[PDB]
Every structure is written in structure tokens, then in C-alpha cells.
Scaffold this active site. Structure first.
Site: not given
Ligand SMILES: NC(=O)CC[C@H](N)C(=O)O
Ligand SMILES: CCOc1cncc(-c2ccc(C(=O)NC3(c4csc(NS(=O)(=O)C5CC5)n4)CC3)nc2)n1
Ligand SMILES: CCOc1cncc(-c2ccc(C(=O)NC3(c4csc(NS(=O)(=O)C5CC5)n4)CC3)nc2)n1
Ligand SMILES: CCOc1cncc(-c2ccc(C(=O)NC3(c4csc(NS(=O)(=O)C5CC5)n4)CC3)nc2)n1
Ligand SMILES: O=c1ccn([C@@H]2O[C@H](COP(=O)(O)OP(=O)(O)OP(=O)(O)O)[C@@H](O)[C@H]2O)c(=O)[nH]1
Ligand SMILES: O=c1ccn([C@@H]2O[C@H](COP(=O)(O)OP(=O)(O)OP(=O)(O)O)[C@@H](O)[C@H]2O)c(=O)[nH]1
Ligand SMILES: O=c1ccn([C@@H]2O[C@H](COP(=O)(O)OP(=O)(O)OP(=O)(O)O)[C@@H](O)[C@H]2O)c(=O)[nH]1
Ligand SMILES: NC(=O)CC[C@H](N)C(=O)O
Ligand SMILES: NC(=O)CC[C@H](N)C(=O)O
Ligand SMILES: [Mg+2]
Ligand SMILES: [Mg+2]
Ligand SMILES: [Mg+2]
Lengths: 542, 542, 542
Positions: A392, A511, A513
Site C-alpha cells: 500500500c 494487502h 497478507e
Molecule cells: N493501508 C495503508 O497503508 C494506507 C496508505 C495510505 N495512508 C492511504 O490511505 O492510501
């Protein structure tokens, strides 16, 4: 249906979620379709409001539920996918009951905890336990309910009262209370102390539940005298008192329950007719002689539970390639030049651990704190050809860095860290938050991830983000080394990026994971572990 | 008067007695005459009925009170001597109240816990707190009351109710509640858990006591976040929350309280105007490079608290001669030939530890279990010239062995182990039990003990025994190596024996360990440590 | 065996003893041999220490047990005779356990409430429930245990914990918990309030007992809405909630339980196959048009329960001769000339009630308070030929008065009121206290009592006294109107006296009221009621 209620006695942090998950995977081996419910007595509706330091990593469900990490443990031990309503909170219950009252659904009578809150809980538990999380068009046989908190927690008392009633609606053949308690030993020359377990069971009995099983957590194994002292003073037979000492892995916790007789207890009491997968993974885990040293460059490192699912996905991957994982948790603020002024020993420890990195992991997070330290590690990884996985924020920062350092757009940043960035590379692009399962489509056949994901056209992966790559500024990257290989089905979002010039420098916006399982490791984490051990090309050609 | 009530939260075994004793020695340095009371919520009148494995060593008072080891800690930290009534039990209270009822002292009214039991406790506490234990003809200024058990113990609830009332008879300037709680940390990668402390303080508040101080016991030091979490959820100021981590010695526990601000708190709240002795002993204890290896050959070795006062007396002695103590606890049953058949590894471990013995200690005990193993160790000590101290049973066994092996009276034993012994050497000689302080007179000037005890004619020492040497059979020993150097004032009892042919082979019928203090080590234990390090002749000539 | 545990909720004074007794007499009609146990959570060993104002009349058992009036209710509803050990107290239990500890019967382990106090209770209950109180050489089938006090009483919590355990030793077919609670109605325009019953059942459930029956005591009958509100919030079926409103007599309380379905519940649950005697007495009691006005001249009149058994014996007698009883309770101090000075309205009310006396009763008591007022009433009775019954003290005072007023020995009194009386007529003559069943022999054939007692040579009656008539001074009475018709078997004690010149002026040294039953009224009380209605000569000739 059958119901198992796992309660915690003294403290929450004793692995009550792993007990509940191990009970589930035991029943799964006995041929039961299992679902799970986590009850969290907090007034919070969801975990989306939380700091990671509070309750650990915010686990994301397919429906966009932001929930506790214990729901992730259910999904890792049982190959199920859960829904929002498999998380019950005091907030959800009280809101539901309030909303009913305003409609007049309680027929002009006074709304109070017993019955109306306790009935709402029973209604929720019944109706959500009937929901198929198993991926079968068939209602499950058994629900494992974990009552989070302790049996001293005043918020939880409504739930215990609900389960007291439920135990007399569903019959005693349908309802089993398991009590997980701590047995501390303050020094090895002192005895193992049972009094907190006695006191906790007395409280539980006062609230109208009798333990079917008492699970005594300790460091070292429980002495027979101590087991008998629990048996007497908790008013329970020795067969019901089981010892879960500290062990090498989670993989042994089902086996330890099996050894202590839990499988037999459930076979007898449920009237049933094994854990060979678990035993295989457990024994394999011991025998690993090779080490892969991975750097986790993370702002939340202060509590390792803040990156629980990420660590689990690395271990799934590492086990699959017969390596031990040396997970070097690096607080990213220590890599920043500020710490070279203020506390240079931490800086040169952190950078030393980053030198010893066979692979680098930059996990997600919110805010600009520690983000310059993440950029330092990504710069190191890019130039020194060290295997990189960015998740992310780690994708956003890699795209930002490539713009800064390879496209010379040194002014490039996110509209999160500096809203009025000159060239706003990473912008807020709402749907609200892009939250839950979304279809990502590959738009480059020669991508490493497409091969790792099994040469599929699309993948469906769990997202939790607001910010995106600004689609106009993609023109700057167009014919350079950094290629946006994966996009959304609506095209305007780039969800995967690779450097073509590097053995493994991957950014994913999702994500992965959360989707990782022991015998199905998440492909991005696999590629990292493979690359870090040279085995990537071998695995790809095979 | 002033009163301090030390309460325990989660478990008893957290060193609550050492906290209470350290509080006392702090107040003693501030110029207060301190007394102590231990409340034990058990229905037992006295500890004379107990197995050592239950509550640790039965400590003996001058008046013949058989009490808990925490009374011994008061006597070691504060150079006081206590009486029977400084031990309060539920048994003593309920019996007193029953006896009053039968006399009609409650005036034909219904006797019930509140008021009559709670009034009896307050009466007892007031009147015994006025008693001089300090050896001065002046009433003390402050009583430290330790409420034994946990605040969950149902037997203790009468005492907490009594103290709730007492807090409103004596004023808030006169009454301080200290709460000792456990803060567990099940793994070093997990947080320190405060919930048991919150829950315990909530219980304590429910029973009508508010902590003035909360003493958080942990392994490692308490984090500031955890200290604030205690402050908030226990509804107490951060100045009142003190961290007592694990340390090298008891000698540091007063200092750690001083550092955490307890001395300041008490100076402020009591309106007072240092621990240099404690700091000297503490810092000295670290710096010791030499080792003395002492074998403790003891049947109760399974819990080290069964020989607490004995171990303390060795450490007092060892510190005084600048040696570390390697106390090799040997379960005496392991030295017996039965264990050579059944579990020979334990036997050859035990006998190896007995080979490495610079000195041998055979402490007291009741029964024939482990007694053949004690005789094995005494035989070894006698022949191989290894320094020996025998206490009570250890004197009896040495006299028995000398008869067996040196006078050839192989049939010799006690009328305890074999009642119908042919030559009954060790007989029951009641007064009941010879219990408490008695005057022993030396009847041999050239005795090693007389010199160690400062060339005094008599000593007064604490006894707890029924059996004695049979006075007729003393004729067998008359002109041999084993000489009965110390007798009772009534002559018919032999209370000390020495081998004249050995560097240090001493039997004493009393328990010298109860009389031992840090800056006044008990002379028999001193002689052992000195002999084991060759320094005996030097110390005697000096 | 079967066990019924009757618990009380809100307050004790709701007739919980009458419920327990009614349950017993119902089971007795179903052909069960019933015994009873009263548990009194007071620390008092016996009721012999009490003021009557505290717990009501001290009931005396055949063995010389001085116990609560509820044991007397068992004996009146069930034609049983109880023993000392059918009264359990906290005093008795704690003393027994203490005595065991001092002997070493608990094997050197720590004695504590659970298990040792709770085991002592279970041991006592089992072993005494096997004892035949029924007068048959056969163990009874069922024990009714009344737990005296309230379920909020801290002293009682050990007993409730014992019964929680006992419920899981004896099976659920063997153990029934009945809960008696108050449903108050502070005004007739306000609702009947269930909250105290809900709260009490919640407490009871917290201590691990579930009501089989809930017995709601109220003034007026319980509304169906209120019955349903109890059913819901006490978590119990409407069949289990029974309404015991106020009624005319105790005779209706078994019938009301029968109507509310308790007999059916017990027949079903115990697997059994009626109260016609009770219904006969009940319906007869309503239909009585005639009145007998009896004066009870009693110092303890302030609480009518101080003369419970005496009142019951009058009502048994009155019912048997088809008269209503107007029991005029007269505080004897009001008849004394002191009250003619200080509060003359009470005096002239008291003396007016004594004018309207068809018969006079002077019951027992201890001390000189109110005793001059008793003498005033006896003087009135003797001279104006009003039927008199004197019990214990009332015999002593009659003998004293006859000496004063008829033998002119105006100096005559007891060595209780004036120790140094010139002619000590009533002396202390111990056996201790003459307490329990003793054989009294008639030594005058023409005595009225011998005929009333069925022309028997001896009677066996319950005594509770220290003082006796001085046997030498009997010579003063020898050939006068006052004749000592009944003596002890050892001759030296006079236990019955009559005036020969009076229709009925009887003194008995015993307490006949304890031996009184509904269908076997105590003969001395019968004679009084008969004499007061002229029917004495008719009854004697018949
Ligand atoms: N899940 C995260 O790592 C969030 C990354 C970033 N703050 C966003 O909202 O895109
Ligand atoms: C009741 C708990 O009692 C005890 C007692 N002793 C020890 C532990 C213990 C707790 C956590 C861990 C742990 O996290 N180990 C790792 C791992 C790999 S895979 C996975 N979890 S998983 O995928 O959900 C599951 C389906 C496979 N964990 C390596 C990271 N290892 C040991 N727990
Ligand atoms: C609140 C408790 O918190 C903590 C925290 N960390 C550690 C300890 C701790 C507990 C016991 C011991 C101990 O027993 N040490 C020895 C000794 C010598 S002398 C003596 N006791 S004494 O004479 O009564 C006292 C007047 C001098 N003890 C060597 C045997 N050492 C450390 N206690
Ligand atoms: C659950 C209780 O609920 C209610 C509800 N409403 C009313 C009463 C109530 C309570 C006491 C009394 C009472 O004492 N009545 C008298 C009497 C005669 S005989 C005897 N008792 S007795 O011999 O033990 C029994 C075997 C026959 N009592 C006249 C004195 N009358 C009514 N009790
Ligand atoms: O210092 C004292 C005095 C008295 N007691 C009393 O001793 C009894 C036992 O109290 P413990 O805390 O030893 O409990 P236990 O043996 O049941 O459990 P663990 O040791 O395994 O934790 C209780 O009645 C208590 O009040 C102490 O525990 N400690
Ligand atoms: O699994 C879960 C779910 C919910 N909760 C809930 O979270 C809140 C905090 O519960 P904790 O046990 O974390 O308590 P705390 O932070 O006050 O204390 P320590 O960690 O220092 O021991 C409580 O409201 C509880 O019910 C959990 O503790 N764990
Ligand atoms: O003044 C108020 C305000 C609120 N409440 C609230 O109303 C609810 C009912 O409280 P009640 O005391 O009316 O209880 P209930 O109806 O269950 O039982 P009885 O009347 O038969 O005794 C409870 O939740 C209480 O806190 C009141 O009772 N009174
Ligand atoms: N204190 C002890 O060692 C007791 C020894 C022995 N049983 C006696 O009473 O003499
Ligand atoms: N029972 C009574 O009335 C007691 C009377 C008197 N005090 C006695 O002991 O003889
Ligand atoms: Mg917490
Ligand atoms: Mg213990
Ligand atoms: Mg009362």
C-alpha cells in the site's frame, strides 16, 4: 447447531484467539463445517478508528469490515472468509437496540440490558452462526464464539449473561464453555500460582457459566499438584484441566490440545466418529537450518502485533521454501537523519540490520511519521538490488521515489503528507475508502506477479486505502523501468507496480497478507522470500 | 498511632512481606519505633499444624508461637522480637468471639461478622499495636499490618471490612493502604498487562479501601505508558504508582522504594523531618568474587521457602566474610540407596553436589522420610573432615550416628523412627513440645560455639522439638570425641554437641536461624562458613 | 435421600419457617418420612444466650438444645422431635473445624472456607438428615433445610456455596431450591414491586443456585402481569412462581401451596403416586363465633414472637373447644404501681384488660423486671377465682405469693431477685440448668392435671430452669390449699403445684407449650381454656 464459548480469565494477551482457532481446526478435522464469531466488548463499531498499538493490526474482510486480528487467526486456521457481523461489539448491539427503540419495535416497553441487549446478542449469534463462511451453500454445524476481554470486564457482563440464557435455549449438548486462564510463576524457584484461575472461575460461575474445559496457560508445563489444586478449587475434574505451555509454533497448539485430550472430549460430548497437516508443518518448522533475513521497516514496530498478518505471511512463505525467518523489525524513524543527530547508536543499529537484509519489506500505515525512513530503505533496495516488497504505502513511496530520483521530479509527494504538493503524484481518489475485496487486472503479461499468482488474468485482493497514483502523471513513467503492471477493472487506478530492472522490486496497493494461509502463502511474499534466497528463477521456471 | 495496611492483589507470592518489611525499615530510619502484625485469613490458629510445602518454614517466636515466615522477615529487617498475638488468624478471631458468646459478653444479642468479628479485629490490632516488640519500655509509633492472601480471598473480606471501619476511627493521617499487585508479561515481545491490577483495585475500592500507594511487581521495569495506564484505570496519581522490578537482593528493595519516592510520600504525609546500612550490604553483595559451596541436605528442598530462615542465616554469614553462597539444595532421599536402584542419575547428581561441599548443613524436620539420606551426608562429613552444622534433627542424627559407627551401638535410633528401638538414644522428653526461647548453658569452656557466641556462659535460643538425647546413655559418649558441650539450665537435656576431633562438626538442638540478623549473623552458621573457607582459626584468634 | 433448601430473599420475617413447615407437611401427606434442619448463620452456638426480643422465643428440645422458634414450627406441623444438631450455626461449624485443625485431622494443609467449612456443612447435613426424628427406627426420605437469614447475609454465603456443591453430589432429582421473597406494595394505588425478587434471584444465581420454586409473599394476591414480570426477570416458568398472600391462619398455608401447584410439582419431580386435617382445622377456625379472652401477662409482650409457642398452645386448645382466642398481651410493668405514677393511662388499660380476663396466663422469663406486675395478676387470679396457668416463673411467683399472702411469710422471695432473701423460698438447685426432657411424677391422685394428662402416673416434659422450690420450706405449705402435686423422680424438686380451693390455679415448672400440637393440645393450656369457658368439669366427667 453447536456453540463453543471461549472465555478469558486473567488477561487477554494469552493467545485465547489461537486456542479458539485450534479448537476450530480440530473440529474441522472431525468433519464439522465451522464458523467463528469474535465478541469485542468495546463500544467501537469497528477497528477502523484504531491505532495499531491499541489492539494490534486492523484486519480487513472481503466486505470491507475493519476488525480485530483474531478474525484473521480464524481465517488462517480455518480456510473461511468472514463478514462484518462475525464481529459483535457492544457498540453494534447498543446501536441496533437504540434504532429498534426509535422505530417502536419494543412495543412501548422499557428497554433494558436484560432482556433487550441480551436478546439482541442471542439473535445475532444464532442468525450469523447460520451464515456460510466456508464457501459452501450449506449452513455450518458449529460456531466458535470468542468472548474477548476478561471475565472481570464490566462491558463483557451483558455477553456472559446472554450466554447464561443461551445455554438454556440451546441445550447442554449444544453449548460448551472453555475458560482460558493464566497460571503465573514469578520465579522458577517459586510455585506456579493457581489463585487467579480459581478467582476467575468463581467470577464465571457467579455469572452463570461452568467451564467444560479450563485451559491453563503457563511458560513451563503444569505440575500434577498444581493441576489437582486447579481441579479442587475450580470444582472441575482433572480431565477438564488442560496445560498449554509455551512451544515453538502455533502449529503445535492443536496437537497439544489433542495430547491433553480435547479432541477426545469433543468426540465424546458431540458424539463424533487427523491433524497430520499441522504435525507436518510443526515438525518441518523445527528442522529448518537455513535462514532468510528479512527487514520489516515499520513505524509500528514497537508492538510486533501491529504487523501480525504480514509476519504470518512471511512465515507461511519461509516454511514453504524450508528457511527460518529472521524478521528484523526496524523502526523506520531510526533510519531518518534526525536520529543520526539525536540517538546515533539506534541509527547505526537500524542501518546495520538493513545491510544484513536479504529482502526488505515496507508494510502499510497512515501518516507521514517514519515515512522518510521508509524512503531511505526503498532507496537502498532499489540501488543495491535487494529484493523489495512494498504494501500500500510501500507502493506509493516507491512510485514517489522513482519520480524523485529516476525521473528527477524531486518535488513529488502525496497529498497526504503535503496537501499542496507541486506535482501531486499520490492523490486521494475515493469510491469513501477503497475497502475490502476488489478485482485487480494484469495489463502486462511479462510481470513477475502474474506468474506467481499462477498466470491468472485478474486477482481479487483486499484493499484498505484512500490514496492512489494520479492517473495523468502516469505519462512520466510510461517507457521507463517502473511499469504499472496491474490496474483496477475501471482502469483509472494502478494497483501493482514493478521495476523491470530489478530481481524483485514489487509494489502492491492491496494487502496480500490477509489472504495468506499456511498451505497457500500469499504470492507477493513468496516472491520476496524466493528472491532473497536466489530460488525465484528456479520456482518460476518450475 | 499510625497504621499501614499492606494488601496483595493478584497472588500472594510476589514478596508482599518484603515490601512490608522494607516499608518498616524505611520508617525505622525516619526514627519511628515500628511494630508489625501479620494477618493470615486461614482458619488455623497457628502454623504448628502445617507441612512446610504449604506456606514455607514455620517460624518460631520467643513465646513459643509457631507462625508464618513473614514474621521472620519483620524480625530480620527490623531488630524486633514478636509475640503470638502479632499473628492474627480467622481461627483466633472466630474462637475469641465464640468464647465471648458462651460467657454472655455480647449481652444476649445476635453475634455476626459485622460488627462482632470486625470489632474483635480492630480491638486486637489496636491493643497489640501498643505492645513493645522493639525491646524499649515505650509504645511504638507505627504498626505495619500485612493482610496475607489476596483481596479476592473470601476469608479476608472480614479483615478488609474491619480496615474500612478502622480508617474512619483512626483518621486519614493515621491510616495508609498500600496495594501490591502483579503486572505480568507472558512474552518479552508482548506488553506488560495491567488488567489484573485494575480489577484488584476495583475490588479493593468495592470493599472500601483506596490505595495510597500501588506497588507494581514485574520482572523487567515498568514502561511509562503502562504506569499511566495504571494511573488512569486505578484512579490514582502517577506519584502513587511505584515499580518494583526484579533485583539482585532484598537489600535493594528499601532503596528501590526510596528511589520510587515512598520515603518522600511517608515524610510528607506523616509530617517527618539514611538507608546507608542497606546500600552498604547491597553494593557489597554484588562485589563478592569468592564462592562458598554449602550443601543443604533437606527433605523439604522441593520448595526453597521450606528452609527460608536457614538460607537467610547462611547469606548473613557469607556476606559478613565476603563470599557468595552456592547453596546446593540436596533432596536427602536422593542420597539413599533406594534412589540408586530407582533413579541413579539423581543419586550421582546428589552425591556429586555433596562431593563439592565446602560445608554441609543438615537442617531440622519431622519424620523418618529422608533421614537415612541425612545420615549418609553426616557420615561423609564426619569421616572426610567436611565442616558440618546439624540443627535439631541434625544433632539427633549425629549423636545416633556416632553411637552406631564410633561406639558400635548399631541398634541405636530415636523413639520417633522406631518406637521400640533396643537402645533408645533419642527419646521423647516433654516439658508438651519444648517450644520457644530457652536458656542453654555451656559446660565445656574449650567449645568452639562458646567462643563464636562471644565467650558467654549461657545463650538463649529458640527451640521447637519434643525429642532429646536420653540422659542415661550419655555415659557411652563420656570420654570419647563427641562431647555434649551445652545443656539446659535443668541439666537433664543436652542442647549442643561437638566433635573435638573435627574442624567444625556441630550439632545444636535449637534453631539458631530464627535469631539471625544481617548485621548480627547467627554464630553456628558463621562458624560453618568460616570453617568452609579456612578462616575459622583466624576469626577465633582475632 | 431428597433435600429441599428453602432460602429467603429480601427479609427473614416473611414466614419462611411456615413455608418450610408447610412443604414438610405436604410431603408427609405424600407418605414421606420428613426431617428438618435449620441453618442459622449467626456465630452463636445456641439460642440460650439470647434476649427474646432478638429472634423470638427460645425453643427447647428434648436433649436440652436451646434453639430458634422455627424448629418449634417443624415440630408443630410434623409430629417429630428434633435434636441439637438439627440446628446448624456458623459458630458450630467454625468450632468443629477449629477443633479438627488442632488435632491435625486436616493433615497439615491450610484450612479455608472452601473446602473445609463447606465440607463440614455437607457432612453435617448428610449425617443429621439420616437421623430419625419421626420416632421410627428407619432413616427418613427427605430433609427440609431452611437457610435462615437473607441471601445478602455475608455469614450465609458459605452455606450457599456448600449447597451449590451439594447439588452436584446429590443429583438434581434429589435437590430442590425454594426461594421465598417479598413483593411489597407501598400503597394500594401503586403497583406490586418485583425488583427485590429479581435482584435476590440474581444474587442466588450468582452463588450458584437456581430456584425450582419462587414463593412470592405479598399482602394482597399477585396480579398476572406481576407474576409474568417475575417469570421473565427471574428467568423461571410461571408454574414455578407461586403467590402466598395473607390469609386467616397457618392452617391455610399448606392448602394455598396445594392450590398454587406445589404438591403437583413435588409429585411430578419426586415421582410420587390429603391435607384434609389441615382443611378441617382451617374451615373450623373461621366458623368459631364464641370468644375466650385470655390475659398473657408478659414482660416480653413488645414482640409477640417472644411467646410464640405459648400463643400456639392456646390456639390449639381454643380450636379444640370451638372458641376464638382473644389473647390480651399485657406488659406486666404496666400493672406495677410505678406506672400508676409515671403513665397511669397504660396502668388502667392493663388492669382493664386484666378485669376482662376469662383466664390468666403468666409465662416464664428471666430476671426481676415485670415480676411485681406478674404478682399483681396472680393475686387478682387467686382471690377473684379467675382461671390461672403459671409456667416456670409463674409457678415460682405463685408459691412465693401464697407464702407471702396466705402463710404470712411476707419476706419470702427467690434467691434470683434478692440473693440474701430472709426465707429463701425459691433457690438455685442445679443438676447446670435443668434443661430438656425430664420425668415428672404425680404424687396426688386428685390433681386436675393428672386427669387432663389422661390419668398417667408420670409425664415427660421440657424444662429450662435453674431455680426450684426450697425442699425444707415445703413444710409451710404441707396441709394448706396450695399442694405440690407433681415432683421429680428424685423427689427433691416440686415441678407442679395446684390450689385445691380454686377452679383452675395451676403452676408447672416445665414449659408444656413446646410439646403442644394442633391435634394434641398441651393439657395445662386446655384446662385453662376449659375453665375460662366453664367446660372443665364437663370435659373431666367425659
Ligand atoms: N493501508 C495503508 O497503508 C494506507 C496508505 C495510505 N495512508 C492511504 O490511505 O492510501
Ligand atoms: C494458545 C497459545 O499458546 C502458545 C504457546 N506457545 C507458543 C505460542 C505461539 C504463539 C504465536 C506464534 C506465532 O505467531 N508463530 C508464527 C506463525 C507462523 S503461521 C502462524 N499463525 S497462523 O498462520 O495463524 C497459524 C495457522 C498456522 N504463526 C511464526 C510466526 N508462535 C507460538 N502460543
Ligand atoms: C518485593 C520483593 O521484590 C523483589 C524483587 N527482586 C528480587 C527480590 C528478592 C527476594 C528475595 C531474595 C532473597 O531472599 N535474597 C537473600 C537474602 C539475604 S538476607 C535476606 N533477607 S532478610 O534477612 O530478611 C533481609 C533483611 C536482609 N535475603 C539471598 C537470600 N532476593 C531477592 N525481591
Ligand atoms: C408463609 C406464611 O404466610 C402467611 C400468610 N398469611 C398469614 C400467615 C399467618 C402466620 C402466622 C399465623 C399464626 O401464628 N396463627 C395462629 C396459629 C394457630 S396454630 C399455629 N401454628 S402452628 O401450630 O405451628 C401450625 C401447625 C398449625 N398458628 C393463631 C396463632 N397466622 C397466619 N402466614
Ligand atoms: O501470607 C499469607 C497468609 C495467608 N494466606 C492464605 O493461605 C490460603 C492460600 O492462599 P494462596 O494464595 O497460597 O492460594 P492457593 O494455595 O489456593 O493457590 P496458589 O498458591 O496456587 O496461587 C488462603 O486462605 C490465604 O488467605 C496466604 O496466601 N498468604
Ligand atoms: O480480544 C479482545 C477484544 C476486546 N477487548 C477489550 O479491549 C479493552 C481493553 O482490554 P485489555 O485486556 O487490553 O485491557 P487494558 O488495555 O485496560 O489493560 P492491559 O492491556 O495493560 O492488560 C476492553 O474493553 C476489553 O474487553 C480485549 O481486551 N480483547
Ligand atoms: O425513575 C426511574 C427511571 C428509570 N427506571 C428504570 O426503569 C427500569 C425498570 O425499573 P423498575 O424499578 O420499574 O423495575 P421492574 O419494572 O423490572 O420491576 P417492579 O416495577 O415490578 O419493581 C430500569 O431499567 C430502571 O433503572 C426506573 O425504575 N425509575
Ligand atoms: N525441629 C526439628 O527438627 C524436630 C526434630 C524432632 N522431630 C523433635 O521433635 O525433636
Ligand atoms: N424458664 C423460666 O421462666 C426461667 C425461670 C427462672 N429464672 C429459673 O431459671 O428457674
Ligand atoms: Mg490492553
Ligand atoms: Mg498457595
Ligand atoms: Mg432482625
Amino acid at each position: 447447531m453447536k456453540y463453543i464459548l471461549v472465555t478469558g480469565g486473567v488477561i487477554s494477551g494469552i493467545g485465547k484467539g489461537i486456542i479458539a482457532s485450534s479448537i476450530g481446526t480440530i473440529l474441522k478435522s472431525c468433519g464439522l463445517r465451522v464458523t467463528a464469531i469474535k465478541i469485542d466488548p468495546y463500544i467501537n463499531i469497528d477497528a477502523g478508528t484504531f491505532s495499531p498499538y491499541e489492539h494490534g493490526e486492523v484486519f480487513v474482510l472481503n466486505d470491507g469490515g475493519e476488525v480485530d486480528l483474531d478474525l484473521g487467526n480464524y481465517e488462517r486456521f480455518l480456510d473461511i472468509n468472514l463478514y462484518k457481523d462475525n464481529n459483535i461489539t457492544t457498540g453494534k448491539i447498543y446501536q441496533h437496540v437504540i434504532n429498534k427503540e426509535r422505530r417502536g419495535d419494543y412495543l412501548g416497553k422499557t428497554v433494558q440490558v436484560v432482556p433487550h441487549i441480551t436478546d439482541a446478542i442471542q439473535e445475532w449469534v444464532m442468525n450469523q452462526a447460520k451464515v456460510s463462511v466456508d464457501g459452501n451453500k450449506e449452513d455450518p454445524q458449529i460456531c466458535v464464539i470468542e468472548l474477548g476481554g476478561t471475565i472481570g470486564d464490566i462491558e463483557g457482563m451483558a455477553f456472559v449473561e446472554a450466554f447464561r440464557q443461551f445455554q438454556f435455549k440451546a441445550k447442554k449438548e449444544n453449548f460448551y464453555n472453555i475458560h482460558v486462564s493464566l497460571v503465573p510463576q514469578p520465579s522458577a524457584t517459586g510455585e506456579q500460582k493457581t489463585k487467579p484461575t480459581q478467582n476467575s472461575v468463581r467470577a464465571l460461575r457467579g455469572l452463570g457459566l461452568s467451564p467444560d474445559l479450563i485451559v491453563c496457560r503457563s511458560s513451563t508445563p503444569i505440575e500434577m499438584a498444581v493441576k489437582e489444586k486447579i481441579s479442587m478449587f475450580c470444582h472441575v475434574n482433572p480431565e477438564q484441566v488442560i496445560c498449554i505451555h509455551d512451544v515453538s509454533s502455533t502449529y503445535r497448539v492443536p496437537l497439544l490440545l489433542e495430547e491433553q485430550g480435547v479432541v477426545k472430549y469433543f468426540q465424546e460430548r458431540l458424539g463424533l466418529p487427523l491433524l497430520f497437516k499441522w504435525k507436518a508443518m510443526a515438525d518441518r518448522y523445527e528442522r529448518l537450518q537455513k535462514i532468510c533475513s528479512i527487514a520489516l521497516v515499520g513505524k509500528y514496530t514497537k508492538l510486533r502485533d501491529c504487523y501480525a498478518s504480514v509476519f504470518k505471511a512471511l512465515e507461511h512463505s519461509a516454511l514453504a521454501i524450508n528457511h527460518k525467518l529472521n524478521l528484523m523489525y526496524i523502526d523506520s524513524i531510526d533510519l531518518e537523519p534526525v536520529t543520526k543527530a539525536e540517538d546515533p547508536v539506534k541509527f547505526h543499529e537500524a542501518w546495520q540490520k538493513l545491510c544484513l537484509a536479504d529482502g526488505i519489506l515496507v508494510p502499510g500505515g497512515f501518516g507521514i511519521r517514519g515515512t522518510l525512513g521508509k524512503l531511505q530503505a526503498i532507496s537502498w533496495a532499489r540501488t543495491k538490488k535487494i529484493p523489495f516488497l512494498g504494501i500500500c504505502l510501500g507502493m506509493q513511496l516507491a512510485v514517489i521515489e522513482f519520480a524523485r530520483n529516476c525521473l528527477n521530479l524531486k518535488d513529488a509527494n502525496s497529498t497526504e503528507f503535503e496537501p499542496n504538493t507541486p506535482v501531486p503524484l499520490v492523490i486521494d481518489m475515493p469510491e469513501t475508502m477503497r475497502l475490502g475485496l476488489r478485482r485487480t487486472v494484469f495489463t502486462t503479461e511479462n510481470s513477475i506477479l502474474k506468474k506467481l499468482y499462477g498466470d491468472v488474468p485478474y486477482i481479487e485482493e483486499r484493499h484498505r486505502h484512500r490514496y492512489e497514483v494520479n492517473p495523468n502523471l502516469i505519462n512520466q513513467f510510461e517507457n521507463k523501468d517502473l511499469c504499472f503492471v496491474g490496474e483496477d477493472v475501471d482502469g483509472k487506478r494502478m494497483e501493482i507496480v514493478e521495476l523491470t530492472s530489478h530481481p524483485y522490486f514489487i509494489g502492491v496497493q492491496f494487502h496480500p497478507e490477509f489472504s495468506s494461509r499456511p498451505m497457500k502463502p500469499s504470492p507477493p511474499y513468496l516472491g520476496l522470500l524466493l528472491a532473497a534466497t536466489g530460488n525465484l528463477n528456479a520456482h518460476l521456471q518450475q
